Every structure is written in C-alpha cells, then in structure tokens.
Amino acid sequence: SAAAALRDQLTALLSSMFSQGLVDEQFQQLQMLQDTPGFVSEVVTLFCDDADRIINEIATLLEQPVVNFDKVDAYVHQLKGSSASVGAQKVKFTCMQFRQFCQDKSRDGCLMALAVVRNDFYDLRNKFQTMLQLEQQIQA
C-alpha cells in the first residue's frame, strides 16, 4: 500500500537508531510515554533545538579572551541531562569527558571536545529529522 509502507520505513528507521548505538532505553521510555500521539516528535523537535543552542552557548564561552570553564562545565552538564532523557547516549557520555577538560582549564580539550559533541549531535539529528518526516506523513 502506502501508509503500511511508511510504518515499515518508520519502524525500519527507528530500528536503525538502536542498531547503530545512537540511542538507548531512555528513547525506548519516550516511546513508552507516548503510549499524546505526537509526543515523541515534539520531544525530539525540542531536544533538537535546545541542544544546538547549548552547543552554541558553549562555543561562545570558548571564544572569550578569558574562558569561564565554570559555565562551560554547567552547559555541558545540562546538555548531558537533555541527552540521557531523549536517549542520545553518546552525546551524553562525551559530555562526561568535558569536566576533565574544564577542570584542566584547557581551551583545546574543550574546543575539540565540543567537536566530538558536534560529531554525535549531527549523526542523531540526521536519524531524528528522517523520523520526524515519516511521523508527519502518517497523515499527509
């Protein structure tokens, strides 16, 4: 048919996420929660936005003549919390490495550190956007 073809794709896309380690049981819990039919799409839409906003705020802190590593550690810990809650486990564990740099007051470990956060955020944003598209076409 058409729709049936979409759920197979959406189920296929979703099975992608976990088979590649991009998401964990917390993402599973969101699915549990939805079971509010568009709940998951909105949560991911929000994470998508508040997530890049924090990356930008950290990039701004790391571009200052004097770096407030106190604040970088705080933004990383907030990003670590948004990640556990939607299930992007890697962004979350990379966030668990930043402290080490902030505490080491290193402007390169934090600057390259954010590059790995970038590495992990966009891989999942990719799988995020596609899912959103399929979830919308359920009723196009």
UniProtKB/Swiss-Prot annotation:
Domain HPt: residue ranges: 36-140
Pfam families the UniProt entry points to: Hpt
Keywords: Cytokinin signaling pathway, Cytoplasm, Nucleus, Phosphoprotein, Sensory transduction, Two-component regulatory system
GO cellular component: cytoplasm; cytosol; nucleus
CDD domains linked to this entry: HPT
GO biological process assignments: cytokinin-activated signaling pathway; phosphorelay signal transduction system; positive regulation of cytokinin-activated signaling pathway
Keyword Iron: no
Residues with PTM Phosphohistidine: H77
Tissues where the protein occurs: Widely expressed.
Compartments where located: Cytoplasm, Cytosol; Nucleus
Keyword Cytoplasm attached: yes
Gene Ontology terms for molecular function: histidine phosphotransfer kinase activity; protein histidine kinase binding
InterPro entries reported for this sequence: AHP1-5/YPD1, HPT_dom_sf, Sig_transdc_His_kin_Hpt_dom
Principal cellular location given in the protein's record: cytoplasm
PTM info: Two-component system major event consists of a His-to-Asp phosphorelay between a sensor histidine kinase (HK) and a response regulator (RR). In plants, the His-to-Asp phosphorelay involves an additional intermediate named Histidine-containing phosphotransfer protein (HPt). This multistep phosphorelay consists of a His-Asp-His-Asp sequential transfer of a phosphate group between first a His and an Asp of the HK protein, followed by the transfer to a conserved His of the HPt protein and finally the transfer to an Asp in the receiver domain of the RR protein.
Top-level lineage group: Eukaryota
Disruption phenotype: Dwarf, narrow leaf, small grain and low fertility phenotypes.
General remark: Plant silencing simultaneously OHP1 and OHP2 exhibit phenotypes for a deficiency in cytokinin signaling, including dwarfism with reduced internode lengths, enhanced lateral root growth, early leaf senescence, and reduced tiller numbers and fertility.
Domain description: Histidine-containing phosphotransfer domain (HPt) contains an active histidine that mediates the phosphotransfer.
Task of the protein: Functions as a two-component phosphorelay mediators between cytokinin sensor histidine kinases and response regulators (B-type ARRs). Plays an important role in propagating cytokinin signal transduction through the multistep His-to-Asp phosphorelay. Functions as a positive regulator of the cytokinin signaling pathway. May play a regulatory role in salt and drought tolerance during plant development.
Protein name from the UniProt record: Histidine-containing phosphotransfer protein 2
Organism of provenance: Oryza sativa subsp. japonica (Rice)
